[PDB]
Amino acid sequence: VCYKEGTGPCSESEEKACKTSGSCRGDMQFCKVAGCEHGEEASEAKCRCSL
Amino acid sequence: LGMLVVKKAKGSDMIVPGPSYKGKVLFERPTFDGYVGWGCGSGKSRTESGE
Structure with a gap:
């Protein structure tokens, strides 16, 4: 699941990116293999994907 | 008191x-190496276990 938590869910351009991108953070089982590059988003964080 | 120091x-x-x-x-x-402290912003209330 991927959700922007503002104006609802992520975009298709976003969720397709967030299986290739390196800025939208997330919980575990999503960083060991899918690679959360954990961009240090102090303000206006990208949309988080969890289980 | 200068005994130990907490780090980011x-x-x-x-x-x-x-x-x-x-x-x-x-x-x-407390960690294997040292002692770790985490902060948020003023007005940035922490209402979930997430970062």
Whole structure:
């Protein structure tokens, strides 16, 4: 699941990116293999994907 | 008192899902190496266990 938590869910351009991108953070089982590059988003964080 | 000093948190360092992170700004976590402290902004209320 991927959700922007503002104006609802992520975009298709976003969720397709967030299986290739390196800025939208997330919980575990999503960083060991899918690679959360954990961009240090102090303000206006990208949309988080969890289980 | 100058005995030990707490340090910031790196992205590779992860939270422990134990407590209920509601209304927080500073929690401790002793580690193998040293002592780690985490902060948020003023007005940035901490109402979830997430970072």
